[PDB]
Each structure stands twice: as structure tokens, then as C-alpha cells.
């Protein structure tokens, strides 16, 4: 298939891997920090989803250095993946408009 769809699919699979690894790594980093809430895997996975999407309900967040570094990777993976799907949609439309126009 075309590159842009393959990159999107790949980005999605990769995003999902980062969400899972990120939930797990966040708990490892945050336990040991008094006051931390990002300490059980189920809510950490939810946290990873809210981080990759930038939804920002604000109910959970890292307080340690490594928990924050993990958070940054999840954000960037999420922003990039959704940015890449947009770029893929644009490429699709540009090609179609070319066809609809006789080129």
C-alpha cells in the first residue's frame, strides 16, 4: 500500500506500544514518591491515553523526574501519531483532487 497509510498504521501500533510501556514505566517511577497517584497499572493506562491525546482532564499526573520524562515520550508519541494521520489524510485528498481535475 502507499507510504502514508503504512506510516499511519505503523504509527498507531507504535503509539499503542508506547501507551502500554508508558503505563508500566510510570508506576515503577512514581511508587516511592510520597503523594504520587500514578501508582496502579489500570489508572496509569488511562493516564497514558489522556497524555497521548492531550485531553487533560487533570485527574492524574507524574510528580517524579522519570515519571515526567516518561510522560514527555508519551505526549510526543501521541502528538506525532495524530499529526501523522492528518498528514496521511491530506496526501490522500491531494491525490484525489488531482484525479478529479484531469491530471
Amino acid at each position, epitope marked *: 500500500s502507499a507510504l502514508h497509510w503504512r506510516a499511519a498504521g505503523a504509527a498507531t501500533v507504535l503509539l499503542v506500544i508506547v501507551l502500554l510501556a508508558g503505563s*508500566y514505566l510510570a508506576v*515503577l517511577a512514581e*511508587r516511592g*514518591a510520597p*503523594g*504520587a*497517584q500514578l501508582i*496502579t497499572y489500570p489508572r496509569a493506562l488511562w493516564w497514558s491515553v489522556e497524555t497521548a491525546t492531550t485531553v487533560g482532564y487533570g485527574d492524574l499526573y507524574p510528580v517524579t523526574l522519570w515519571g515526567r520524562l516518561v510522560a514527555v515520550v508519551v505526549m510526543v508519541a501521541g502528538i506525532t501519531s495524530f499529526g501523522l494521520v492528518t498528514a496521511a489524510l491530506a496526501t490522500w485528498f491531494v491525490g484525489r483532487e488531482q484525479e478529479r481535475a484531469g491530471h
Partner: antibody, heavy 118, light 106 residues
Framework: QVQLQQPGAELVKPGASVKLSCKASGYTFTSDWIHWVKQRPGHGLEWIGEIIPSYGRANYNEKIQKKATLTADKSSSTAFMQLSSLTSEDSAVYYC???????????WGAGTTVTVSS | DILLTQSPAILSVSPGERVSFSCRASQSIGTDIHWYQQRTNGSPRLLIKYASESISGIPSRFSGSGSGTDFTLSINSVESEDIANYYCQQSNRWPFTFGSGTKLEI
């Protein structure tokens, strides 16, 4: 069948150290945490610390004098707690418990009675 | 760290009566409270998780409720085997902590 196996007792001379063990069977995941809880006679349960065997990381009750050091041997599925320089205050039953990373202690060991005496 | 207060320390009830144990947290912890039962010389046994969720193997008589800072563990129709110490434990913030325990007397 018994999920968590602990020795019945350990006698320790004042000033000496002892290594308690907690052998796990049943389902085992890379995400399990093994906790240790202390209970002095007539008293409640006091959380001592925790360890995730798959990684080797340990956390401790910071609020109490640190008497313990946690380690784990992945090949024998055993978690250990090194108690050092003990006094009669350290005499108590020490439980190990398994937590699936979701906050509660699903199953507990029978406990090891530690007596600090000469 | 979160202080879990269990008062009264001893609860006396008559046979077959509904009984309620109280557990109060120093700050809001959602429903991240779990209950354990510990009979004389036995090890703790999980009774209720996340305030009101059932554990397989535990009698229907046991139930839990509450959210925020105030929690309750109830037993419909107390019977002799229920004589024990009851503890609450929170997992909302690190480190996990235990309540001071309530002993049930019939």
C-alpha cells in the same frame, strides 16, 4: 494451593540480622509486587516496603527507622527481606503479600514469627 | 501520607444484627479503600476491594460503601465466625497505609 510460602519462625540475637524469605507459586506476572507487613503482638498491620521482582526495584516505609532491605531471586520466585541490627522492638510477625499492581493484597503468606532474644 | 482512622476500636453487637465498621481518610481517596479480615492467629484476608467490590469466596453478608473520605464495611446478620479484627487500607497515594483496626465482639 498455598500461593505464598514463608518460614514459621526465626530466632535472632540482639544486634544480629536475619533474611526472611517468601516463595511464590500460582500465576506469576512481570507486574506483581511483593509487599512486607509487620505486626507486633496485639497491634495492627504496618506496611514495611515493596518490591517488583521482574525489575528488582524496592520502596520502603520512610516514616519508621529503616531496618529492612528487599531483594528477589527471579529463578526461584522468592522475595527476601533483610532485617539488620535488631532490638526487641523488631520482634513481631512479618507477612509477605502479593499485589497485582492494582492496589490491594489479594493473597498473604502465613507469616514468619521473628523473636529477638539472647 | 494518608491517615486512615478506624473508630470505634471495639464494636459489640448481638447475634444476627447488622453491623457497620467505620474507616475515615485524612483526605479524599475516591473509592481506593480495601477491607481485610484477620481472625486470631490467622493472616489477613481480603474481604472487599475498591470500597464495595465483592471478592469470590467471601459471604454475601459482607458489603462495603462510601467514597471520598468516609467508608463503611457492613455485615448483615453477624455470626460467631465473624469475630475478628477488621482493617481498611488505601491505595490512592503512595505509600499504601492501613487503618488501626476494629475488633468485632458478639
Amino acid at each position: 494451593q498455598v500461593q505464598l510460602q514463608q518460614p514459621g519462625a526465626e530466632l535472632v540475637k540482639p544486634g544480629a540480622s536475619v533474611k526472611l524469605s517468601c516463595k511464590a507459586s500460582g500465576y506469576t506476572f512481570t507486574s506483581d509486587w511483593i509487599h512486607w507487613v509487620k505486626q507486633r503482638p496485639g497491634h495492627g498491620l504496618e506496611w514495611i516496603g515493596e518490591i517488583i521482582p521482574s525489575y528488582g526495584r524496592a520502596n520502603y516505609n520512610e516514616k519508621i527507622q529503616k531496618k529492612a532491605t528487599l531483594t528477589a531471586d527471579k529463578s526461584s520466585s522468592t522475595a527476601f527481606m533483610q532485617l539488620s541490627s535488631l532490638t526487641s522492638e523488631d520482634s513481631a510477625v512479618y507477612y509477605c503479600a502479593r499485589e497485582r499492581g492494582d492496589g490491594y493484597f489479594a493473597v498473604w503468606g502465613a507469616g514468619t514469627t521473628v523473636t529477638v532474644s539472647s | 501520607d494518608i491517615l486512615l482512622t478506624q473508630s470505634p476500636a471495639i464494636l459489640s453487637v448481638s447475634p444476627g444484627e447488622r453491623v457497620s465498621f467505620s474507616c475515615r481518610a485524612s483526605q479524599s481517596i475516591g473509592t481506593d479503600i480495601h477491607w481485610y479480615q484477620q481472625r486470631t492467629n490467622g493472616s489477613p484476608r481480603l474481604l472487599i476491594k475498591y470500597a464495595s467490590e465483592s471478592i469470590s469466596g467471601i459471604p454475601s453478608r459482607f458489603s462495603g460503601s462510601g467514597s471520598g473520605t468516609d467508608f463503611t464495611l457492613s455485615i448483615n446478620s453477624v455470626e460467631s465466625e465473624d469475630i475478628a479484627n477488621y482493617y481498611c487500607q488505601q491505595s490512592n497515594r503512595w505509600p499504601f497505609t492501613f487503618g488501626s483496626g476494629t475488633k468485632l465482639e458478639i
